[PDB]
Every structure is written in structure tokens, then in C-alpha cells.
């Protein structure tokens, strides 16, 4: 009798139960830092299991932090719109222009005609291309720009699968989403400028250790490319096994010819390229080049033109500058010339197709991280990590790597690395084991945020495309994170200590 | 030829021309004040001319200020989201819950049954209800909540007239109702500190800059705002009913063959709605809980160690998020929470949020660039003119420049300029700040002036010339009434003639 009533209203009952069961944490402990811990636990629990919509959960910090007195409501609101949101708006303008004029369909059909009919090679090509392109621009930018093309490819293959005559389509869409999202292994690990975490680490190391000049482009790549490539290959294998099937003999039929014929027929139906598509392609190229030319790290960029106000113009300035141009560039004339022209995209079309839910979710994650920093919660974890000097070096490395890769779960990678570096470096120098030996694994594992969205902006951008099953993302991310941690361990043990000389105390380290 | 190509591409050519022609100012002056002034001029020109979408123009500060070097892009992005947006989200949840479950039509039909079918009495009732709601709710939230109900009212009125007969008058009535809601929202907002974010910003600025002064509170603000608000509301109602429908003398005070038929058909519509059911009542309960907490918690008294941490936006979020988990319908056997995030997303004015954030960022860049100090220095020699002429000029300037920028942005821009000016002329700071704060809310000429105007104009019944014609008269009436109130009754209560002890010498 009552069992059915409990089963039907499981979400409401679970929400109430998890609010009340963690309630003793604030009242007990004299209300010191368990309030922010309780807020984080409740929000994370609601994020793991779909008790509430993800954006509704992201709005919870705006309730909990002000009432607990951790930080004022004005500051919590100010934390909801950040630089990433301007970047997202700028990129979404371009994405709307791409999809409205069927440029994505044309690119997808051309790519399918060229190579990649087999799903395994298609996924491998997506991962390799996204990983290579993310070497230079950013994780967020590349994950945002290459995702529409992959979605178009998958949609076109699904449409052509009819062959003049399902469960496979959605699982392939999830696999494509995850492989685009998880292609952070090359995008930032390999190059110092690839990710934010790697610029912050380099700046901190140079400031704290001016004598050591080993960290530069062409030396980060040497020790980081093998590990990142191994992670990429193993993650591709793991994703191809988890979703769909893996057969060794298949990678090592008339349906393929029928699909190729359908794809060719559709491509011919597209016809010659249009003016709007040409303009959109040119603006895409200009945006990508401007992102690449901000600060390559080996040659001066255009930021040297502004070499008086450093850090003022970020990637989002480029995104906005090239995206707002879509609202004023003429697309069609209303040759009657009745009233005026029309823009490439109108605000009506931009309001839709905009991931407002993703913006709210990332804002909520930012607010939660800021609330954790404001209270003595992150500092508490860092101070708990400090008294491990008596432990062996490898155990210290493993504990630090796991703690960093699990604390970047709910906080942005730059915030986690900026928090942990001042904590680890005195700990590294307390023992005589080569502070790089402990700094490298932590900064490598900080970017391994493959679990849940909002942890990494690429994850949220990919999550924006409707395949909102968090449990699948968690299942894939656990394996990818384990693979990444294992490969980082193997690299520290094998490849990195020859060139960085991580076994003995260096001269540049303080005595 | 050339002329036809210029005529078709008006907006593109105008945008390029305005960007290029004002470039001499930053190129020659080489000062941060000039660059901020250039950004202000470009944004204002695009807002009046509407060459670019209002949100697209609002995003221009985040592209211009970082490039000019005024402040980093991170600060500009941080300036786009404030407590007003949290309040807006919290109240849009409730508005979505009201509209989805057909509560707006029920309230509309009950109101029509109560106050008959005469358009002027309906307009009076709408203005009174909107003012009462905006006394506690923000003007944007008040408009978003109220406007669907009046849309239902007018749609039912034209339906009844068409069926009884079996139009231009109905279109005029819809225009008048939209304008009256848009104005009355702000008119009610002027009454209280929490009615508008403009009053909250002014109050916090006055408290921070003048800690010694403790005059401002709910009671004082109500005492010197209620008479002016009532007079302005009544005169604006008279102006609106004279403009569109035409004035009446005695037929207004005082059944017609069509009247009983319309009442009857409204009655059958009301029974066609059916008895009140679930997915309602709970909406009313949550709304009255929101209002009760709004005028009970903040009249606090429970969170004393943290004063000002929890505000009306916290209560709005607390009540609104309950619309995402309370079950509505059975069936996976998972229930329905009375709102799906898709429904909230297709109701939330994201463009309004971006526009207000852009205004906030532009104002913040205005203080950071130092342009506000330059404006205050240039306005300092106003001491020669009498105090009444000084306040008249200040109020006229504020109400003229509030038609382009949002009310909170305008007030937060002008407070750091006006407050030192009051101290310089050795005059009571309140004597200058209060009229300016009251006249800041008088933004009626354009949809960009305040978000309620944009919400009203979004329905497409109104057009810009009618809004301008009504807003000019309402603004004149408001300025005159505010000046009269300052001259007559506010001074005896506040002793504004003498220089206060809290103000620096
Ligand atoms: Na990257
Ligand atoms: Na993270
Ligand atoms: Na305004």
C-alpha cells in the first residue's frame, strides 16, 4: 500500500530526507565551517542523482550561503556571471549562425564523404582532431566550437541509416558528447598555454623559483606528450567499450555503400555554398585565429599591442567581438527592397539555442567554489593535507594527486591549483625531494575533471546538447580519471625523472 | 542607385558611422574619461536609435571597457549579475506557475465580474492592484506577474463583444491597459524602499556615505512618498483615459442591453473554467507566503550576527525553488513539479537580465574611469543659482538621462556625482538626493528606459510613438508633483533647509 506511494514520490522524499539528514552538521560543530560543508554536500548529492534539475540545484548556493552568513547575497549574485559566460555568449552567437544557415550540415556531409563511415574511426578522428586543436586555443573554446560539427556528423549518419528502409542513435550521441568533452587530455597537458591550470602553475613556479628555468614550451611538451597520448588512446578504448561494442577484428557490406550513396545524394541536394555560409566560415576562422594569436607562448601575440594593461582583454573579448558582428552583418534583403535588410542572426533566434541552463549551472558552481573559499573549508582541507611529512614520497604523491583530482570535482581547475600550490610547495621543500616531483602530478591531475558538468566548462558545454544523463557521464569519467591517474603515476616513475632529475634535491630549491 | 542602397541598409551604415565619428574623442584626448565618455555615447545612441538589439548593446561595455584598459574583463563580467537578477528569477518562477495552471484567467474573470466591463473602472482597478503589488515586489517582477492577467481580461472583453455582436476600440483598450500597467508598476514602486532596487541602492549609498544619519527607514519613506505617489497615479490615470478613450464627466460615475449579455457570457466563461483545483491554491499559498515574508522578515531579527546577508531575493528564491519540487501530476511514475525547467526558461526575460547587467557594468566603468569625478567638478559651479533651481536642474537632468539607462544604473551612476555636489554648495544632502532618487524612476518614454516598459512593449500591442506621447505627460506630472512635495511637506518633516550635523562641513 504505502510502498507504491513511497516509490512514486521518490524524488521529493529523497530531497526532504537528504536535507534533513545532513541538517545536524551545521547545528553540531558550533557552526564553524560545517555550514559550507553541508551546503556543498547537499548540492553535490543533488547533482549526482537527478533529485532536482541541475540549474535548480545550482541556484541553491544563492539560498544557503546568505542565510548561513558565509557571504552576502550580493556577492553570491555577482559570482553567477563571470568571464566564461561572456565567452559562452560569444561562441553561441557563432553556433547559432552556423546552424541557422546549415553550414554544420555541409561540413558534416563533406567530412563523412571524405573519411569516417565506421563509428570507431569516426570517434577516433573526433578525439584526435579535438585534442590537437585544443593544444593551442583552450579546452572551453575548442569544446564549444567542434561540438556542433560532431553533432551534425552524428545526426547525418543517423538520418542516412534509414537506407530507404533507435537505441543506437542516442548511445552514439552520448559517446560523441563524452569524447568531445573528455578531449582535455591533449588540450592543456601538452602545452603550458593549453589550459589555465598550466599557466598558473608556470607563473607560480617562476615566481617562487626564479633560478629554475626548465619550465618552458618545448620542455613541457617533451615530458607531457607521451602521457597525454597514452591517456587519449586508453580513454578512446574505454569509451568505445563502455558505449557500443568493441571488436578487434572489425577495426583490424552493402549497408556502407547505401549510406555513402545517401550521403552523396544529400550533399548534392545541398548545392553550391551560400553567401551566409561563407561569411560564417570566415568569421569562424577569424575567431579561431584571434584566439590562437592572443598569447601563443613561443612568439609574441596581439596582446603585446596592449602591453600596458595586462590581462584586461581575455579570450571572451575576442569571442564577443567576433560574435556580436553576427547581429549586424546583412544576410538577406527584405530584391524588392521593401523596408530594410535582416541580420545573420536575430536576438529572437539567439535567446533560443542559448544554454541558459548551462549558464545558471556554471554560475552556481562558481558561487559554490567562492563560498567554499570564503569560509575556512578549502583552507581546512589544505591544512589537513599538510602534516604528511613522515609519509613516503610516493604515498604523499598519491594522496596529493587523489585529493586534487577529487577536489577539482566541485571547484574550477584554476581555483584548485592556485589553492594547492602554496600548500604543496612548502611541503615539497620540507622533504628534499625535488619540489617539481610533487608539483607536476598535482597540476597534471587538476585538469582531470571528467566527473559531472560544471567541474570543467567543456563538460558543461557538451552537457548543453540535451544528452543530460549524469550517470553515464559519471560512469565514463570514473574510468577516464583512473586511467589518467595511472598514466600520470607511470610517467612520474618512468619518463619524467630522466630529464627533470626529480630524485635528488636541486640547487635552485631553497636549502 | 546609391540612395536606394543607403536607404535599405540604414542600421549597418548608422552603426558604422556612429562608431567612427566618435573615435576622434579617444584618439585625440588620450584619457580614460574620454574613452568612458565615448563608450557611454555609443551605448546611449544605440539604445535610443535601437540600431542594435538592446541586449547586444548592453554587451558592448564588456567588449569596450577591457580593450580601452578601463578595467579588466573579469570585473566587467562580474558587474552583469546582481541581487535584482536573483529576485527576478525567484518571481519569474511564481509567474510561470501562475500562467501555466490557468490561474491568470481565473483571477481575470473574477476581477471582470467584480468591477464590471467599463474600461475606465477596470483601468483604475489595474493601476491600484499593480501599485499595491509593486509596493513590495520590484517593478519588473510586478509587471511580469500582472500583465498576463490584464491580457486575459482584455482578450475576454473583445471575445464577449465579438460574440454579442454576432477591433480598433479593443486595440486602443489593450494599448491603454498595457501603458497603465507599465506606469503604475513604477508608481507603486516609488512608495517603499524595497519596492524598487533604485530605492535600495540610494538607501545603501546614503547609509554608507553618511553613517551618522539615521533618518531613512520604512516609515519615513512611506510618509513622504505615499501622497506624491497617489497624486501622480491619479493624474496619470486621468491623462491616460483622456488620451486614448476620451474623457467622461458623469457617465463615469454611474443596465445596457449589451451590458447584461456581456456579464452573462463572462459568467458562462467563469463556470467553464470550473471549480478551483489543485496546482492552484498551492500557487496562491506560496505567493501569499512570499509576500508575508517580504513585509515581515524585512520591516531580520533572526540573523543578527550577519546583517544584510539575507535579502528579499533570498526569500524570492526560497519560495520560487519550491515550484520545482512540489508534485503536480502523477506520471516512469515520476511526478510533475508544477514547473519544468523548460517552462521557466521560456518565460524568464533573459534579454532584460542582460540589459540591466550591461547598464550596471557601464555605470561601474563610469565610476572606475573617473568620469563621474569630472562631471561633478564641472557641475560644481552650480552654487550661484538658488537651491530650488539647483534641484530643478538636477531632477530634470536625471529624468532626461533615465530614458536611455535603467533606473538602478542611472541612480548608481548619479549618486557619486550628486552627493559631493550637495556637500559643496553647503546644502542638505537629502534635499538633493531625495528628489533625484524619486525622479530617477520616472522612465516612461522608451521601452529601454526601464524593464517594465520592455515587458509591456514585448506583447506588440503598443507602438513607440504612443509610449512617448503618454510618457512625456506622465513624466511632466511626476516631476511637478515631486517638486511640489519637496517644497511643501517634505521639508518640515526632514528639516532640509538647515545644514545637517551628519553631513561633513
Ligand atoms: Na586547451
Ligand atoms: Na574542476
Ligand atoms: Na530608467
C-alpha span between B281 and A358 (Å, rounded): 32
CB-based contact (8 Å) between A342 and chain B?
A: no
Chain B nearest-CA distance from A149, in A, is 25
C-alpha span between B119 and B245 (Å, rounded): 9
Distance of CA B62 to the CA centre of its chain: 24
Closest CA to A187 of A176, A198, A175: A198
CB-based contact (8 Å) between B64 and chain A?
A: no
Task: Please name the residue that has the C-alpha cell 491600484.
Answer: B128
C-alpha span between A317 and A304 (Å, rounded): 15
Is A10 exposed, middle or buried, given 0-12, 13-18 or 19+ CB atoms closer than 10 A?
A: middle
CB-based contact (8 Å) between A327 and chain B?
A: yes
Dist. CA A493 → ligand 2 center (Å): 25
C-alpha span between B187 and B179 (Å, rounded): 12
Contacts of A308 in chain B (CB under 8 A): 69
Neighbours of ion ligand 3 (CB under 5 A): B 402, 406-407, 443, 449-450
Task: Please name the residue that has the C-alpha cell 521529493.
Answer: A12
B313 and A73 within 8 Å at the Cβ level: the answer is: yes
Dist. CA B407 → ligand 3 center (Å): 4
The stretches of A134-166 forming alpha helices (DSSP H) are 139-160
- This structure's resolution (Å) is 3.0
C-alpha span between A457 and A359 (Å, rounded): 10
Residue B204 to residues A23, A298, B197, B214, B247, Cα–Cα distance (Å): 34, 49, 10, 12, 43
Residue of B nearest to A87 (CA): B77
Buried residues in A437-467 as b, exposed as e (16+ CB within 10 A): bbbbbbbbbbbbbbbbbbbbbbbbbbbbbeb
Q: Is the dihedral of CA A465, A470, A475, A477 positive or negative?
A: positive
Grid cell digits, residue A167: 537505441
C-alpha span between A430 and A388 (Å, rounded): 10
Buried residues in B153-179 as b, exposed as e (16+ CB within 10 A): bbebbeebbeeeeeeeebebbbbbbbb
Residue A94: its H or E element: helix A83-100
SS (H, E, C) A392-421: CHHHHHHHHHHHHHHHCCCCCHHHHHHHHH
Residue of B7, B14, B66, B290 best to disrupt the A interface, most CBs of A under 10 A: B66
| B192 contacts B299 by C-beta, under 8 angstroms | no
Chain A nearest-CA distance from B311, in A, is 7
| A40 contacts A367 by C-beta, under 8 angstroms | no
Q: If you compute the radius of gyration of chain A from its CA atoms, what whole number of angstroms results?
A: 24
C-alpha span between B352 and B81 (Å, rounded): 12
CB-based contact (8 Å) between A127 and chain B?
A: no
Residue B471 to residues B398, B446, B465, Cα–Cα distance (Å): 15, 8, 10
Closest CA to B367 of B28, B42, B40: B40
| B66 contacts B76 by C-beta, under 8 angstroms | yes
Task: Please name the residue that has the C-alpha cell 578487434.
Answer: A248
| A370 contacts A414 by C-beta, under 8 angstroms | no
Dist. CA B453 → ligand 3 center (Å): 10
CB-based contact (8 Å) between A5 and chain B?
A: no
| Ligand with the closest atom to the CA of A453 | 2
Residue A473: its H or E element: helix A470-491
CB-based contact (8 Å) between A394 and chain B?
A: no
Residue B22 to residues A503, B26, B42, B329, Cα–Cα distance (Å): 62, 8, 8, 58
Contacts of residue B487, defined as CB under 8 A and 6 or more positions apart, other chains included, come to B388
CB-based contact (8 Å) between B357 and chain A?
A: yes
DSSP class of residue A325 equals G
Closest CA to A477 of A173, A238, A170, A139: A238
Closest CA to A371 of A359, A382, A379, A383: A379
Closest CA to A128 of A238, A233, A243, A284: A233
| B446 contacts B468 by C-beta, under 8 angstroms | yes
| B368 contacts B70 by C-beta, under 8 angstroms | yes
Contacts of A62 in chain B (CB under 8 A): 86, 313-314, 317
Neighbours of ion ligand 2 (CB under 5 A): A 408, 413, 449, 455
C-alpha span between B22 and A310 (Å, rounded): 26
Experimental method: cryo-EM
Closest CA to A126 of A456, A491, A467, A462: A462
Contacts of B350 in chain A (CB under 8 A): 351, 354, 356
CB-based contact (8 Å) between B334 and chain A?
A: yes
Contacts of residue B421, defined as CB under 8 A and 6 or more positions apart, other chains included, come to B376, B379, B380, B382, B394, B432
CB-based contact (8 Å) between B89 and chain A?
A: yes
DSSP class of residue A250 equals H
Contacts of A12 in chain B (CB under 8 A): 325-327, 335
Please tell me which of the candidates B9, B53, B311 has its beta carbon nearest to residue A330.
B9
| B348 contacts B87 by C-beta, under 8 angstroms | no
Residue B461 to residues A44, B346, B466, Cα–Cα distance (Å): 46, 20, 11
C-alpha span between B61 and B68 (Å, rounded): 10
The phi and psi torsions of A505 (rounded to 5 degrees) equal: -65, 130
Amino acid at each position: 500500500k504505502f510502498f507504491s506511494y513511497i516509490l512514486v514520490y521518490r524524488r521529493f522524499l529523497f530531497v526532504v530526507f537528504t536535507v534533513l539528514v545532513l541538517l545536524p552538521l551545521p547545528i553540531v560543530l558550533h557552526t564553524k565551517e560545517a555550514e559550507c560543508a553541508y551546503t556543498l554536500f547537499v548540492v553535490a548529492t543533488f547533482w549526482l542523482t537527478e533529485a532536482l534539475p541541475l540549474s535548480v540545484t545550482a541556484l541553491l548556493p544563492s539560498l544557503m550561503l546568505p542565510m548561513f552568513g558565509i557571504m552576502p547575497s550580493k556577492k553570491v549574485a555577482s559570482a553567477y556571471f563571470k568571464d566564461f559566460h561572456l565567452l559562452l555568449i560569444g561562441v553561441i552567437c557563432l553556433a547559432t549562425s552556423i546552424e541557422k544557415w546549415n553550414l554544420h550540415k555541409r561540413i558534416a556531409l563533406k567530412m563523412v564523404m571524405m573519411v569516417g563511415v565506421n563509428p570507431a574511426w569516426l570517434t577516433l578522428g573526433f578525439m584526435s582532431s579535438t585534442a590537437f586543436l585544443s593544444m593551442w586555443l583552450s579546452n572551453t573554446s575548442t569544446a564549444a566550437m567542434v561540438m556542433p560539427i560532431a553533432e551534425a556528423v552524428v545526426q547525418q549518419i543517423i538520418n542516412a541509416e534509414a537506407e530507404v528502409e533507435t537505441k543506437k542513435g542516442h548511445v552514439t550521441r552520448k559517446l560523441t558528447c563524452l569524447c568531445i568533452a573528455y578531449s582535455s587530455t591533449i588540450g592543456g597537458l601538452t602545452t603550458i598555454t593549453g589550459t589555465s591550470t598550466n599557466l598558473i602553475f608556470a607563473e607560480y613556479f617562476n615566481t617562487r623559483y626564479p633560478d629554475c628555468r626548465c619550465l618552458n614550451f618545448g620542455s613541457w611538451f617533451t615530458f607531457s606528450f607521451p602521457a597525454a597520448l597514452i591517456i587519449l588512446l586508453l580513454s578512446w578504448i574505454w569509451l568505445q567499450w563502455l558505449f557500443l561494442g568493441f571488436n578487434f577484428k572489425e577495426m583490424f557490406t552493402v549497408q556502407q555503400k547505401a549510406c555513402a550513396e545517401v550521403i552523396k545524394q544529400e550533399y548534392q541536394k545541398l548545392g553550391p555554398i551560400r553567401y551566409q555560409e561563407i561569411v560564417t566560415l570566415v568569421l569562424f576562422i577569424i575567431m579561431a585565429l584571434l584566439w590562437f594569436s592572443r598569447d601563443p607562448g613561443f612568439v609574441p601575440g596581439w596582446s603585446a599591442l596592449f602591453s600596458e594593461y595586462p590581462g584586461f582583454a581575455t579570450d571572451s573579448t575576442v569571442a564577443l567581438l567576433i560574435g556580436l558582428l553576427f547581429f549586424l552583418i546583412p544576410a538577406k534583403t527584405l530584391e524588392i527592397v521593401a523596408f530594410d535588410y535582416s541580420p545573420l542572426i536575430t536576438w529572437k533566434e539567439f535567446q533560443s539555442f542559448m544554454p541558459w541552463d548551462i549558464a545558471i549551472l556554471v554560475g552556481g558552481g562558481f558561487a559554490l567554489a567562492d563560498g567554499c573559499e570564503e569560509s575556512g573549508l578549502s583552507k581546512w582541507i589544505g591544512n589537513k593535507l599538510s602534516p604528511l611529512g613522515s609519509l613516503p614520497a610516493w604515498l604523499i604523491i598519491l594522496i596529493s594527486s587523489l585529493m586534487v583530482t577529487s577536489l577539482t570535482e566541485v571547484a574550477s581547475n584554476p581555483a584548485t591549483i592556485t589553492l594547492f600550490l602554496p600548500i604543496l610547495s612548502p611541503l615539497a621543500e620540507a622533504i628534499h625531494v625535488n619540489p617539481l616531483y610533487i608539483l607536476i602530478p598535482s597540476t597534471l591531475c587538476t585538469s582531470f575533471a571528467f566527473l559531472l558538468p560544471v567541474a570543467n566548462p567543456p563538460n558543461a558545454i557538451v552537457f548543453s546538447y540535451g544528452h543530460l544523463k549524469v550517470i553515464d557521464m559519471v560512469k565514463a569519467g570514473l574510468g577516464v580519471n583512473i586511467v589518467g591517474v595511472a598514466v600520470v603515476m607511470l610517467g612520474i616513475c618512468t619518463w619524467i625523472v630522466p630529464m627533470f632529475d626529480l630524485y635528488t634535491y636541486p640547487s635552485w630549491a631553497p636549502a
